[PDB]
Amino acid sequence: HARSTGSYSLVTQQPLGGKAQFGGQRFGEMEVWALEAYGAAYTLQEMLTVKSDDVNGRTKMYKNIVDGNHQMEPGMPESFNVLLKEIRSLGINIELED
Amino acid sequence: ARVTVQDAVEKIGNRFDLVLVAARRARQMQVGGKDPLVPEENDKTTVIALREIEEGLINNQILDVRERQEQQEQ
Amino acid sequence: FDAIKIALASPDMIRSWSFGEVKKPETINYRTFKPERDGLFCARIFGPVKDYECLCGKYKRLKHRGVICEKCGVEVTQTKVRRERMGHIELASPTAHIWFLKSLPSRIGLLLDMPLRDIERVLYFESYVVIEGGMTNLERQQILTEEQYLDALEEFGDEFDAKMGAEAIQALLKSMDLEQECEQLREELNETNSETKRKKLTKRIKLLEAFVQSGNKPEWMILTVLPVLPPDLRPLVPLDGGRFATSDLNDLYRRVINRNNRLKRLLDLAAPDIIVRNEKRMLQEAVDALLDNGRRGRAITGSNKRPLKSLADMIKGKQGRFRQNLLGKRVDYSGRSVITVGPYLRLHQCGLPKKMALELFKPFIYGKLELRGLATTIKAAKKMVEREEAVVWDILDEVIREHPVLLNRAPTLHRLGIQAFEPVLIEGKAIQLHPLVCAAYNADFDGDQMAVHVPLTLEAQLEARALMMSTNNILSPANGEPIIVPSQDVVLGLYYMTRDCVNAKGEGMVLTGPKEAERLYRSGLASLHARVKVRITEYEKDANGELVAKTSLKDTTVGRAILWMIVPKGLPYSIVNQALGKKAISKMLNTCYRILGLKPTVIFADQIMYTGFAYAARSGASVGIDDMVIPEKKHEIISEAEAEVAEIQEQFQSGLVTAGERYNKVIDIWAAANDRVSKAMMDNLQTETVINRDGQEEKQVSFNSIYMMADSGARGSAAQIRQLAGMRGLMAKPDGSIIETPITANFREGLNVLQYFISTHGARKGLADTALKTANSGYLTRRLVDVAQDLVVTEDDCGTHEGIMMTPVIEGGDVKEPLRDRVLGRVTAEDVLKPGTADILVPRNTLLHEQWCDLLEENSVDAVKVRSVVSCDTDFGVCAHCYGRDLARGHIINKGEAIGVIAAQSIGEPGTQLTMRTSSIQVKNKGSIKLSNVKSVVNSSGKLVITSRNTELKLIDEFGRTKESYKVPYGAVLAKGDGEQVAGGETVANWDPHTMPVITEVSGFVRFTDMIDGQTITRQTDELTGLSSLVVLDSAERTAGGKDLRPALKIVDAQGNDVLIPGTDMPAQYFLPGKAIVQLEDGVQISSGDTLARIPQTGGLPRVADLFEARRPKEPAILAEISGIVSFGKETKGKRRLVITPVDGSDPYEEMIPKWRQLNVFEGERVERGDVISDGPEAPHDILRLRGVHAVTRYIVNEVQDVYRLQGVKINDKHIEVIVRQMLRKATIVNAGSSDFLEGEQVEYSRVKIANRELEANGKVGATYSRDLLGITKASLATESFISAASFQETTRVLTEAAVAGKRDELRGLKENVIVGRLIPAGTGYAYHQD
Amino acid sequence: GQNMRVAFMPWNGYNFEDSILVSERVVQEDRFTTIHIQELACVSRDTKL
Amino acid sequence: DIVLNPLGVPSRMNIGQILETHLGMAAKGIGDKINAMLKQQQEVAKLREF
RNA sequence: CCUGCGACGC
RNA sequence: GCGUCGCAGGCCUUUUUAUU
DNA sequence: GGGTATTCGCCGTGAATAAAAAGGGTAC
DNA sequence: GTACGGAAAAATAACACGGCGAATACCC
Ligand SMILES: [Mg+2]
Ligand SMILES: [Zn+2]
Ligand SMILES: [Zn+2]
């Protein structure tokens, strides 16, 4: 099985799972720990934001790879916004201050 | 080709800033279109930047004074 | 952005979050897909359903943006606002929050100082409570029943107020001042002598101060306004049949809205109280089922007999948002296939299929086709790629030549499971992997799969090429051993090539070089094993970098000369002239990497693998039925064993020996028969050759394929050959014992049914242990990672002088690790002095490499004080001098490396190799003994007795170092003194077991004081004539008239006067404890050392799991908390009383000991802080609070290494010291002086260090603290960061404490930066944060 | 299954850990060709309009 | 047809595959002798007694 | 909101 | 070199099997 | 009657992924 | 064939280990 781009979910904007749905591989917690054991910080940031969650980030990354530029924008993952909206529905006030 | 990068690690202090310096050098050739110092042999900008680190013609201070001369020129 | 802030939510904030109010329970129509007017799926509240179109019509356009329609009132905007807008439910009655009520400890129960059961009775309409009764008999908070409220109404009608439900709790929480109550609690805390009352008072004061410092109100816990979720986060999916299936949250919201509408409709019609009480109770239960379904009562099930999912189930657990959507995600540009072997590949490249490379590199080929001009439109490039034209493969080969890929296996136990390789376009559907990385990947080719990943940015490609390349990772970071060791085929080929026989073709001819040897081998004129004379030319770089050549005639074989062409110039010839096994090739690669470097070592390993795969095929090694030979003396050994078993059974049948001695003798003779069978088999398999040199025979090493595969170290060990050729031996039972009938056959001949059914027990036990170890190993690895994720090297030298003392560990049999394996790669703390003269041998801040180890091993040095990680004074991280080396390179540890993650991955990786299922000493060599911590007295016979509790018996050889170490009990005698030496092999110390005698220091007349017959002593006559002794009765089953009567043996002289002890002014009397049998009646002149009284009496992975969790053992060894004289007290029919009386200060100490435990402590002794009272496993908390930090650090390190040494696992000590430092991070305040801390609160160690440093800099007094120990689970939850504590375990109580405390959480770590999706402060991200 | 002529020897690392070297005559004779049958349905339901 | 590796035989103790290999070789030898007798024009009595 | 498909404008 | 029209898709829980 | 101090409930925890079915509101 | 969604029978079902807090019983 192999995949560059494809369909995404509704609630959490992530790639699907399975060969029949044309899904992608899962980068679990142990792979994150193995990347943290190296000095590979940009690879983990690319795996966590552009390749998985950030819609604007992955569209700008696709346009930059098509144009020929190897540069990405971190942005904000959508799963963190889903987590904030789900914790905020329990009557607990959590927000990013600046 | 660059199988090992030990001569690039021997120049700068550790291996972590080597990635940042080589990325800052490689972004000038693909986006800025600057001509490299070492003659390329069917290589991408990563291998050219690593060879420029290995030959000792590129470091942090050289890129800093080159950016300073570019700011003073324009 | 800045730090994360979490607090309580006011109802005004909930109304400000919302955009509308939901009033109808229905979600959507079934016949029409349009949303409802005012429902859970709305258009005028949450947003429109389609992009820039309203609901009613006429506004489906782009020029109208953000306008409000007049028909339905739907804002014309994007659909993306539907996943962020919220609503609210105006409840007719207040409800209590289930998180601040049911999660122990209860926040409402601690604030109101009320038990949880009474609040549960009041909230769920089962009892009454008075609120501000005034001048009445009832107090401020009293729990009234149903009848007591009627009595209070009919007795006190006016000036009375009692409510039932959440309104009473809201009125209690609203009418309460925090400052006055906190001041009253402080003034009550000053007049407090109890312990647990003081604990509850400090907990209530800390909760009140948490409510005061935070901006929240105590009445905000009672829910008034209820917010809802956006509809895109809980959508209604369509089905093929047309029926719209519902979710759990939509059903719970519909239930809550329907019950609230029923309550409003019933309150409109002015109902009586009985029905509306049940309606408010049902609304409370519906709100509690919506918030957390399963905490209170029974979880409601719908149509599945399964509990429904609430708002709390989506956050915690394995299927929550943290562990399934934030800590581990699904990524793009990735693939998966079955792996195969590529022999032609190099160490830095791998074989990638073209069908996977065409899919993983789509936009690169698109950009190259748009750049070259072959496709101007992106659709034309997509059709050109889908048609698979000729130039598409050329573009794909162009965009793959120097673009690495990340190959990864499914179990990632350490960092070598994700390595970078260069793709080679192959034909097929399998991935070709290099054979040398299979030992690091732990993956064979029987059906294993691996995942690939494609970096895209320049920084990711540079991190893959510089940090994650397979040529850069050749040493393991756990211990420093290589990971590019050759496997079975390469060592088999290099073992077959480098051998010799006494007679072959071409033996005894002079050769001019290795090229003539290769020519003679490939021409067929000389054999591969033929002793010849080859002129070699080896180089040596013993000068200042330059290489010196030499030429001489060597006596070698033909194959070693051919292998000499593979060996580079810097290596000598003496490393290849022997038979190459496995450790020989390993030390050859070690010598090549040590002398030459990294770049020739990769080419050397590749050429070694190439020549091994080339010369393993020319041999033709094969197994057969004739290779596994049978010893000719096996049948006669079985005959003598059966004759001995028959003789032992005939002796047992007569009645001379018991059944256990018979079984033990049978086991020993069968073990001896198995050892003789194995010895005869190994003797038959060694030589097995009668070959003529010229005309006479000569023995040589066997060329059997089984012996060549077992001797070279390719595959199999000696036990496998014993089970294949000799008898299998004794086999165990599932109950744990050993069957007396062994397996006298092998796998070559036919086994019967019983010998197979016996071995099925051990096979099933091993399979079940292997299947059940992996979950505990993964749990321990996850706990170690989450407890050691925030330790990054931030400095270089903090300037400290503390450190641990490195000594080689001695148990009593032999040594295991010398000083060199424990001191290598560590910076010393103090100057190591020469044993002869006090001059400085080595400075302090020196990295001890192998040359310093060779200099220290020749000067007879045993104790080297080095700097440790736990003794570092760096705030929020460590320095580069207290850690040591990198353990994968030759330099020092860099600034920015995450040393905690590699430590947790180094400890948690070999957990799959551990286990889960449950009188005299003899010296080894000749040397003088060293007696330390011993108080003795010379007896009359010339022996040497011990009058101390603990005594260290160490052996000092002629070199001046410590080789052995033993432990002797209290009552023992020594065969020789301390001055003379031991010849070796004789008994030095001997003692009788199961006895506890008392030894006197003086010799004189013995008198009986306070000893009356019939009450405290029992004179029994044994039936044997030898035993007629007196027994002292225990002080529990005695009568009431002799509770204070305690016997004692005063020692006087022959003249009757009381002799004294030299040094003090107390009589030399010895009291008798319970069940102490004395010898005889007094009246005999005893000697100095006499026997007076006679007193009779989990390892593996759970051991490491209990050691890292700081778990208290079942039978802890009680120690002495304070120094002084031991004294027993009056017991209270349960536990035994004991009190330690000091010599100078007062006695603020009193403890109890359980009477059923054994105490090896007499009445009057002299103990100090550190000595033990009983015998058993110790607890690390007592070692920390009594001895110190370094003692419990060495204890944990030695107890972990003793478990990890039994399985043959090499793990460095710094990785355990990282977990030891992470276990102790908090401190308990003893006396807070001029500080904002309380008396008995727990703060961080670095925070109180910074506070004491600032108070010392400002000229004020500091604070006295005490460090405490916590497990790997407790330290992960007791952290200042609430995000890392909620994502690991127990999300509900962590979020509850963060809500009631108002915590502001800065990231400052790896896991917090993983969640928000940015660069972690490690590696390149550390330099990014610095710049 | 099928029974074929077998040999136990290392061949240039192509049977390294557990790998199996198969000749081309096994592929030419088609003695390991299997037939796999799938099922694709098309449900025509009755709905509105 | 298939070349296997003999390295897994001492480590993983399954000696029955080598006995199956030898017995299949003997069975194929008997079958090739029967096929060589049937390929040439032979009578029924010699084939029956073999 | 994002993918893939079919059609049309400058 | 993009924008407009129409079609299909984005799930949840449980059970079983297989692999590492 | 205050200060302990054993018991006894209760909650949290128990590895990581690919395929193939079955069911998504039942009552009066 | 549309419409409130609860609690009591169900001829229900039923883990081992560990830490923390509350009811409660000893000991002067
Ligand atoms: Mg396998
Ligand atoms: Zn409208
Ligand atoms: Zn330090």
Swiss-Prot record, chain B:
The keyword Transcription applies. Keywords: DNA-directed RNA polymerase, Nucleotidyltransferase, Transcription, Transferase. Its EC number is 2.7.7.6. It catalyses: RNA(n) + a ribonucleoside 5'-triphosphate = RNA(n+1) + diphosphate. It is an enzyme of class 2 (transferase). GO terms for biological process: bacterial-type flagellum assembly; bacterial-type flagellum-dependent cell motility; cell motility; cellular response to cell envelope stress; DNA-templated transcription initiation; intracellular iron ion homeostasis; nitrate assimilation; protein-containing complex assembly. One of its GO terms (molecular function) is DNA binding. One of its GO terms (cellular component) is RNA polymerase complex. Promotes RNA polymerase (RNAP) assembly. Latches the N- and C-terminal regions of the beta' subunit thereby facilitating its interaction with the beta and alpha subunits. Belongs to the RNA polymerase subunit omega family. The RNAP catalytic core consists of 2 alpha, 1 beta, 1 beta' and 1 omega subunit. When a sigma factor is associated with the core the holoenzyme is formed, which can initiate transcription. The rRNA transcription and antitermination complex (rrnTAC) consists of RNAP, NusA, NusB, NusE (rpsJ), NusG, SubB, ribosomal protein S4, DNA and precursor rRNA; S4 is more flexible than other subunits. This is DNA-directed RNA polymerase subunit omega. The lineage of its organism: Bacteria, Pseudomonadati, Pseudomonadota, Gammaproteobacteria, Enterobacterales. The chain holds residues 2 to 75 of 91 of the full protein.
Curated annotation (Swiss-Prot), chain C:
DNA-dependent RNA polymerase (RNAP) catalyzes the transcription of DNA into RNA using the four ribonucleoside triphosphates as substrates. Resistance to the antibiotics salinamide A, salinamide B, rifampicin, streptolydigin, CBR703, myxopyronin, and lipiarmycin can result from mutations in this protein. Changing residue 742 to S/T: Resistant to antibiotics salinamide A and B. Acetylated on several lysine residues in the presence of glucose. The RNAP catalytic core consists of 2 alpha, 1 beta, 1 beta' and 1 omega subunit. When a sigma factor is associated with the core the holoenzyme is formed, which can initiate transcription. The rRNA transcription and antitermination complex (rrnTAC) consists of RNAP, NusA, NusB, NusE (rpsJ), NusG, SubB, ribosomal protein S4, DNA and precursor rRNA; S4 is more flexible than other subunits. The modification N6-acetyllysine is found at residue 954. Zn(2+) 1 binds at residues 54, 56, 69, 72. It holds the Pfam family RNA_pol_Rpb1_3. Mg(2+) binds at residues 444, 446, 448. Disulfide bonds: none annotated. Keywords: Acetylation, Antibiotic resistance, DNA-directed RNA polymerase, Magnesium, Metal-binding, Nucleotidyltransferase, Transcription, Transferase, Zinc. Changing residue 764 to C: Resistant to antibiotics salinamide A and B. Changing residue 763 to T/V: Resistant to antibiotics salinamide A and B. SUPFAM superfamilies: beta and beta-prime subunits of DNA dependent RNA-polymerase. Its EC number is 2.7.7.6. This is DNA-directed RNA polymerase subunit beta'. The lineage of its organism: Bacteria, Pseudomonadati, Pseudomonadota, Gammaproteobacteria, Enterobacterales. Belongs to the RNA polymerase beta' chain family. NCBIfam families: rpoC_TIGR. InterPro entries: DNA-dir_RpoC_beta_prime (IPR045867), DNA-dir_RpoC_beta_prime_bact (IPR012754), RNA_pol_asu (IPR000722), RNA_pol_N (IPR006592), RNA_pol_Rpb1_1 (IPR007080), RNA_pol_Rpb1_3 (IPR007066), RNA_pol_Rpb1_3_sf (IPR042102), RNA_pol_Rpb1_4 (IPR007083). Its cofactor is Mg(2+); Zn(2+).
Curated annotation (Swiss-Prot), chain D:
Acetylated on several lysine residues in the presence of glucose. Co-administration of salinamide and rifampicin or salinamide and myxopyronin suppresses the emergence of resistance to both antibiotics. The RNAP catalytic core consists of 2 alpha, 1 beta, 1 beta' and 1 omega subunit. When a sigma factor is associated with the core the holoenzyme is formed, which can initiate transcription. The rRNA transcription and antitermination complex (rrnTAC) consists of RNAP, NusA, NusB, NusE (rpsJ), NusG, SubB, ribosomal protein S4, DNA and precursor rRNA; S4 is more flexible than other subunits. In pull-down experiments interacts with CedA. (Microbial infection) Interacts (via flap domain) with Escherichia phage lambda antitermination protein Q; this interaction renders bacterial RNAP resistant to transcription pausing and allows it to read through termination signals. DNA-dependent RNA polymerase (RNAP) catalyzes the transcription of DNA into RNA using the four ribonucleoside triphosphates as substrates. Resistance to the antibiotics salinamide A, salinamide B, rifampicin, streptolydigin, CBR703, myxopyronin, and lipiarmycin can result from mutations in this protein. Belongs to the RNA polymerase beta chain family. This is DNA-directed RNA polymerase subunit beta.
